[PDB]
Amino acid sequence: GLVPRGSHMTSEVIEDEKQFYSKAKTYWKQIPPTVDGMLGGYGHISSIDINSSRKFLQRFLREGPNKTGTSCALDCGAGIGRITKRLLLPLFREVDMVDITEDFLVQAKTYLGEEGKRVRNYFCCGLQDFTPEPDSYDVIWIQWVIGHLTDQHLAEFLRRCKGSLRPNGIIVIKDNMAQEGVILDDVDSSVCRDLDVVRRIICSAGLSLLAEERQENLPDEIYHVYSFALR
């Protein structure tokens, strides 16, 4: 028969792309603009996440003959700026944020406090319609949002990001990974993809893998989380 043991691409699990996006936008509009909101009830893990991200990223900034710069970073799917506040602003002179939910970007101005004065652009846009500026960012940080893009949109977005990188720049994807296949969450209207699917999409965007690391010390019940450094 035609029905496979499991799905391995978004076209197998997304019935209607327009509705996939509109339902996700509606979902996020209804979430409190708080760290626990950003983390789906896992606010208590935020420091574990941030401290691992810092160690992961610092190697590129501090080590080697071709160091990644610290001028400008872009936080993608940034929400209220949880990552911008604790990871990026302390490391980069300037940060831009892009998120589909305007109210989160508005809350960011409060949440980020005085250091938030160094957030330059707050872009209210879906990543699928966003073009980061060519030759603009040392680091493009994409966390806990790739499941909201279709395969074609994710591939193209990553390709646009590649063009946005300054010399020695990197893209980091940090996100949920499925054990096998592609799984639809029909509540928040997102997918979770396995490592092979994500690797295929990275390759299709013309990106090379620099590092790949599974996040330790996370809640036992949640999807595994991986960080990929790319350029």
Binding site: G40, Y42, I45, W144, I183
Partner: peptide, 6 residues
Amino acid sequence: XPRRRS
């Protein structure tokens, strides 16, 4: 963000 495995 983090999500319980389905």
